Write a protein that binds this ligand. Structure first.
Ligand SMILES: [Mg+2]
Ligand SMILES: [Mg+2]
Ligand SMILES: [Mg+2]
Ligand SMILES: [Mg+2]
Ligand SMILES: [Mg+2]
Ligand SMILES: [Mg+2]
Lengths: 395, 149, 404, 96, 99
C-alpha cells in the first residue's frame, strides 16, 4: 500500500471566522433556554467524572522519586483534577468545533498542567492533507486586538463533532443548528410580546351616544381621570348616564403553551437531547419500549462522544506528557474512561445477586465502582470475599 | 496580513474618535478656569486649578495635558531640580517619572496628543469653542478634573 | 513546552475588572446583585434553594493515607484530618456561606485570620459586593479594590492579591479568574419575571373580580348629571351593601355588571416560573409549579440526574479551590503537617435516599469491607483495623468469636 | 432484525475486505483463519440475560455464560468448559 | 517636546563636543543637589545621569570630525553645520533609535 493518503480531502485552510467563533461565545454566555440545554448536554457527556486504566499497570512499578509508582499512579498525580478538566474541555468541544490548549511546565521544567485556551480566540491553519500546522489567535486588548500565529507543535486540540473521520478541524453544533436556534429565539420573543398585548384584558371606555354629540380629547382627559386603572381598587363600582359604555378588550386566546412545546420539540431534537430535558412532556412516550428506546438513543450518543474524547485526550495530551516528563513507557496501553451518567446502581446490585457466582471479585468491585481487594487471590476468585473469610475462620 | 493591518487601523481610528469626543467635551464644558496670564505656568498653575475646583467643593483627581504644557511643566524648577522636587525622577525619566502621576493631590496623569482636540479642520468634524495648546494667549493646555464626573 | 502561557486572553490590556460581557465589572453591578439578593420574594427564594441544594447537606474531610501522618501537635497525637477538623470546626456553615456567595456573585472572597499569639484563627469571608479584582494582561488577579458605605459616604482601599483568597464557581473560560455572576447573566430573565408578576397582580386587581355598573336614566330620555349620580352612588354603595341586599327601582335604572373577564393567569404564572427556573438551572418543581408526564418514570429519572450532575459539577469546582487556596495555605503556614498531602474536601449529595443505600448494602455487602460499608452508610468506621478491613459484618465476626 | 441484518452485512465485508488483507500482508498469522467481528446489540437488557442465566445456566458452560454476560471468560480452561458455576467449583475445592 | 508634538517618543541623543561642554556647565546638572547626584561634576560624560536624562535611555557622544562637511576626498558634504559655537549650528540630535 502507501505511507501517505492517496485520496483527497475536499478542503484547504487557506472554514469559519473569528466572528463565527464569537457568535458561539455570544450564544453561550447570554444564558436562558438555549444555553441551559447545551449545558445539560455537557453535564450528561462529561459531568459524571473519569477513571484512568493502564493494561498491565502492575508491571510498570518503578521508583520515580525515592518511592514506587505505577504509570496509573503517576498519571493520577500528573492530572489531579481530571474530572474538572474533562468537563471543561468536553463542554468546549460540544459548543465550539474543538477544545484547544497548551502543555505547561513548572519553573524547574517538570510538568505543571494541560492549560485550556479560550476557544473562540483561536482558529486552526491546515495543509493540503487537511492536518493542522499552525493556530491563528485574535484577542481583544486595549484599543483593539492582539493577533499572533502559534506553531501546532506545542498546542493540542480535541474534536468531538466531525464532518468525516478525516476532519481534523470539526463542526460547531451551534453553527450547524444556527437556524433552529434563531427560530426558537424568534418564537420565544413573539410569545413574550403577544402575552403582554393579548394575555391580559384591557378596559375600553366609549363615551357619547352613537350618532349623538361628539366628545373631544380635552373631554376624554376628564373621563380618563375618573376611570384611571392605576387609581382603581378591586371592588370599585361605577355609576353613569346611558351614554357611557365600559367595554373590554378580552384576553384573546392563543395556544402559547402549544407553541412553546413545538419550539422545545424542535430545539431539543436538533441538539439531540430528549424532549424531557427541556421541561416538556409528551403522551405515551414516558413508558415501556417507547421510553427504553429514547433512553438507549441518549446513552448511545453519550458513549460515542465519550469514546471520541477519551482517545484524543490520551493520544494528544497524556502520551506526550508521559513521553516528555515521565520515566515510564509512553507506548503503554493507557485508557481514560468517562463514567455513565444514567447508570442505576440498584440494577447493578440486582445483577450482582443474580449472577455473582460467575463473576470474579475484581469484576464485581469494578462494576460496583469500588477498589479491588488487597489480596490478588481473593480479587481473582469467583465466590465472595465474605464467603472466603467465614471459611478461613471456620477451617 | 493586510486585513490585520486594516483591523488595527480601523480600531485605532475609532479610538482616536472617542479620544476627540472626550477631549472636546472636557476642554469646552469645564465650568472653572485658572488663567495663568503667561506666568507661573508649572506646579503653581496646576495647584491653582485644583484650588478653583476645591472652591466649588468638588475634589479633582486627574489631569489631561497638551504636549506644550508638559514641556513647560518639566522645565519648572520645582520639578526639574531634584532638590526642590524631592527626587531626580522628572529630570531623568520626564513624563514616566512617578511624580508626574502624583502631583497637587491628583493621582492620574492622562497625557494627550496635540491633534486630538476638534479644531474643526478635519472634514465631518465641526470644531469646539476653545483652542487646545499651550503656545499663545487663551490656549487651554491642561484640564484638572474629577475622573468620575 | 514552556513555563508561562503563550496563548493570549481577551483581557482589556490589564488594570480593569474585565468580565465575560466584553466590559468592566463595576461596584454598581456588584450592588445590583446585592439588591436582587436582599429584596426577598420568589427570585430570592429560588437562588436560596439553589445554594441549599449545592451546599446545604454539609461536608466531610478526607486525607489519603492519613493514618501514616500521626504526629504530636501539642504533646498529644493528631492526623491531618483531625487537625483540619479542629482548624475548621464549623465548616458546614462556611461551605454554605461561600458556596452561596459564589453562585450569587462572580466569586466568594475572604481573608486568613490569626489569633493574637499568631496561630490560625479562621478563614474569614468578606462581603463580595464590596470587593472587585484587578486582572493583568494574562487575566490573573494582581490586586483587590474595595469600597464600602461608611457614615454617609464611602471608604475605599486597595489590598494585594497576595493575602486574600477567592473562589469562582461560574467561569467564562477555564482561564477566567474574575468569573461570571448568574444574577448579572440572567438579569433580563429576572426582570422579565418580575414585570410579568407585577402585570398579573395588576390584572387580577382590575379584571379578576366582577364590578357593579349602575346605569341611570332612560336611553334617549332625560339626562342625569354628576350631582344626580352622586345620590344614586349612595344607594348602591358597595362599601355598605351586604350579601342579601335587595333593590327596588323604576324601569329607568339598570344594574349592569362588568363580569370578571376570564384570562388564564395560572398558565402565565407557570410560563414565567418555567422561564425563571430553567434560566437559573433549577428544575421546574423548585418553583412550586408542576407539569404532566414529567413527574414519573424515565422522564423523572432524567431531570433528577441532570440536577444531580449540575450539583456534583459545582461541588467539585468549589472543593478543589477551597482546598488549594484556603486549606493548603493554612496547613503550610500554621501546621506541623505536610501541605503536599492528598487532602479532599467532599460535599454531601443532598438527594441521597439512605433506604436505597441500605438496599445496596443488603444486596452486595458480601463484596465490601466494613470500612466501605461505614463510609456509604455515613457512620464512623469500626475502631479495630482488622474488623474495619474485613468483608463480613462485625456482628458476624462477633457471633462466630462468641462461638469459640 | 433491521439492526442485525445491517450489522452482519457490515461485519462480513469489514473482515473480508479490510482485516483479512491486513493479516495476509502485515502479519505472521494465517489469513484464512475464522476471524469474526461481532457488533453489540444496542437494545439488549442485561436484566433479561440475568434472568435467563438463573433459569437455564445448568445447560451452559461457564464460557458461554461469560460470553452472554459480556465478561472475559475464565483464565482456566477446565472451569471455563465446565457447566456448573466457578463459585460452586471454588466452594467444592475449599471443601477438600 | 518637539518630537512629542509629532506623536513619536524619542529615546536617544547624539551630541557634539561643544554641546557636551555647555551641557555639563548647566547648573541643573553641575550642582549635585539639583541633579540628585554629584556624578556629572565628578565624571563628566561617564556619569549615569548623562545616559538617563529627559526620558532618553541612551547618550551617544560623537566626535567633531565625524559629520560630512564635504572637505574630505570622495565625500560630498551634508546640508547642516555640525557644531555648537555660532548662530545656526546643529549641536545635538534627540531621536528614536528604532526609527
Ligand atoms: Mg352636533
Ligand atoms: Mg467655580
Ligand atoms: Mg530612564
Ligand atoms: Mg330634554
Ligand atoms: Mg514636527
Ligand atoms: Mg572619576
Amino acid at each position: 500500500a502507501s505511507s501517505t493518503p492517496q485520496t483527497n480531502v475536499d478542503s484547504m485552510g487557506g472554514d469559519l471566522t473569528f466572528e463565527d467563533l464569537r457568535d458561539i461565545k455570544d450564544v453561550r454566555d447570554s444564558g436562558g433556554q438555549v444555553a441551559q440545554l447545551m449545558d445539560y448536554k455537557a453535564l450528561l457527556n462529561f459531568g459524571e467524572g473519569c477513571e484512568i486504566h493502564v493494561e498491565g499497570d502492575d508491571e510498570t512499578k518503578q521508583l520515580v522519586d525515592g518511592e514506587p509508582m505505577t504509570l496509573s499512579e503517576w498519571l493520577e498525580d500528573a492530572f489531579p483534577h481530571l474530572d474538572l478538566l474533562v468537563l471543561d474541555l468536553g463542554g468546549d468541544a460540544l459548543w465550539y468545533p474543538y477544545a484547544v490548549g497548551e502543555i505547561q511546565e513548572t519553573i524547574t521544567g517538570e510538568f505543571k498542567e494541560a492549560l485550556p485556551a479560550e476557544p473562540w480566540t483561536l482558529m486552526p491553519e491546515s495543509d493540503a492533507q487537511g492536518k493542522v500546522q499552525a493556530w491563528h489567535q485574535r484577542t481583544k486588548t486595549h484599543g483593539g486586538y492582539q493577533t499572533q500565529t502559534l506553531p501546532a507543535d506545542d498546542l493540542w486540540h480535541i474534536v468531538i463533532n466531525k464532518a468525516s473521520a478525516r476532519d481534523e478541524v470539526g463542526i460547531s453544533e451551534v453553527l450547524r443548528n444556527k437556524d433552529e436556534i434563531q427560530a426558537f429565539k424568534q418564537n420565544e420573543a413573539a410569545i413574550n410580546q403577544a402575552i403582554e398585548l393579548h394575555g391580559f384584558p384591557q378596559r375600553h371606555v366609549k363615551v357619547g351616544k352613537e350618532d349623538g354629540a361628539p366628545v373631544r380629547d380635552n373631554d376624554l382627559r376628564r373621563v380618563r381621570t375618573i376611570f384611571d386603572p392605576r387609581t382603581t381598587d378591586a371592588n370599585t363600582a361605577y355609576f353613569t348616564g346611558q351614554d357611557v359604555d365600559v367595554e373590554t378588550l378580552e384576553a384573546h386566546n392563543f395556544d402559547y403553551s402549544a407553541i412553546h412545546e413545538m419550539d422545545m420539540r424542535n430545539l431539543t431534537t436538533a441538539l439531540g437531547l430528549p424532549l424531557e430535558a427541556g421541561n416538556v412532556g409528551a403522551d405515551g412516550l414516558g413508558s415501556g419500549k417507547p421510553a427504553e428506546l429514547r433512553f438507549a438513543l441518549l446513552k448511545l450518543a453519550i458513549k460515542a462522544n465519550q469514546r471520541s474524547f477519551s482517545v484524543q485526550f490520551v493520544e494528544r495530551v497524556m502520551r506526550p506528557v508521559v513521553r516528555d516528563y515521565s520515566p515510564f513507557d509512553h507506548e503503554a496501553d493507557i485508557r481514560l474512561e468517562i463514567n455513565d451518567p444514567l447508570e442505576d446502581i440498584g440494577e447493578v446490585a440486582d445483577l450482582i445477586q443474580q449472577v455473582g457466582d460467575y463473576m470474579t471479585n475484581e469484576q464485581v468491585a469494578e462494576k460496583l465502582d469500588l477498589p479491588a481487594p488487597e489480596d490478588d487471590e481473593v480479587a481473582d476468585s469467583y465466590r465472595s470475599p465474605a464467603d472466603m473469610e467465614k471459611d478461613e475462620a471456620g477451617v | 496580513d493586510l486585513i490585520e493591518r486594516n483591523i488595527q487601523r480601523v480600531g485605532a481610528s475609532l479610538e482616536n474618535g472617542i479620544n476627540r469626543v472626550f477631549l472636546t467635551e472636557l476642554v469646552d464644558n469645564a465650568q472653572n478656569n485658572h488663567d495663568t496670564a503667561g506666568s507661573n505656568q508649572g506646579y503653581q498653575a496646576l495647584n491653582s486649578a485644583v484650588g478653583e475646583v476645591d472652591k466649588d467643593d468638588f475634589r479633582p483627581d486627574t489631569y489631561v495635558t497638551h504636549p506644550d504644557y508638559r514641556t513647560q511643566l518639566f522645565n519648572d524648577t520645582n520639578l526639574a531640580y531634584a532638590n526642590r522636587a524631592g527626587t531626580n525622577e522628572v529630570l531623568r525619566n520626564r513624563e514616566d517619572a512617578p511624580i508626574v502621576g502624583d502631583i497637587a493631590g491628583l493621582d492620574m496623569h492622562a497625557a494627550m496628543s496635540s491633534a486630538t482636540y476638534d479644531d474643526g479642520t478635519d472634514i465631518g468634524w465641526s470644531g469646539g469653542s476653545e483652542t487646545w495648546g499651550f503656545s499663545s494667549d487663551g490656549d487651554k493646555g491642561a484640564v484638572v478634573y474629577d475622573r468620575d464626573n
